[PDB]
Amino acid sequence: NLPDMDRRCEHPWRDLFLWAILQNRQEMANYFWAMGPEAVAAALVGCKIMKEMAHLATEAESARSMKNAKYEQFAMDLFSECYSNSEDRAYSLLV
Amino acid sequence: NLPDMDRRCEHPWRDLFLWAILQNRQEMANYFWAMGPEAVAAALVGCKIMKEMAHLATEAESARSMKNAKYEQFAMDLFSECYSNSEDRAYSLLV
């Protein structure tokens, strides 16, 4: 079921962002998100995964960092920029 | 009952901090606390002694300085650092 081990990823930035997010590395995850093709969906997925891991976090420092992921803030800011730009392509982007 | 007058103190920084604290010298007391072996207990003892002397203070300026000893703040900050570091050695430190 696994793909070809030598075949390059179809969505490299998506996989890198997902990988960096599963391990609470936020600075790196942020850099990967800044390079991904679809940023609003990536930010929402990131915030979902962060708030999901916040419960499973053992260390208090890691849980505190996870609760302040502010990945939803990135999505809101980028969508505010998009809405200010077009306001007609923004709806198509949403839907 | 007194110890040997020429014998060096077993806990020099503790005695210096205690001495500097009994006389409302806070800057010096702070420096001694920064050098002591056990800092959380020293800070709590310092804040206890300060709030105990605050009642006995005659001058209003001395009482005002004593009520703002913020030695408990030092203990809280240092324990926050310790808890963020290990969170498992912090409990052993507490108990």
UniProtKB/Swiss-Prot annotation, chains A, B:
Family affiliation: Belongs to the transient receptor (TC 1.A.4) family. LTrpC subfamily. TRPM5 sub-subfamily.
Function summary: Monovalent cation-selective ion channel activated by intracellular Ca(2+) in a voltage- and temperature-dependent manner. Mediates the transport of Na(+), K(+) and Cs(+) ions equally well. Activated directly by increase in intracellular Ca(2+), but is impermeable to it. The activation mechanism of TRPM5 involves a multistep process.
Lineage: Eukaryota, Metazoa, Chordata, Craniata, Vertebrata
UniProt comment concerning the protein's domains: Contains two Ca(2+)-binding sites that are allosterically coupled. The binding site in the intracellular domain modulates the voltage dependence and the accessibility of Ca(2+) in the transmembrane domain.
Span covered, complete protein: 489 to 583 of 1165
Highest taxon above the source species: Eukaryota
Known partners and oligomeric status: Homotetramer.
Compartments in which it is found: Cell membrane
Name under which the protein is recorded: Transient receptor potential cation channel subfamily M member 5
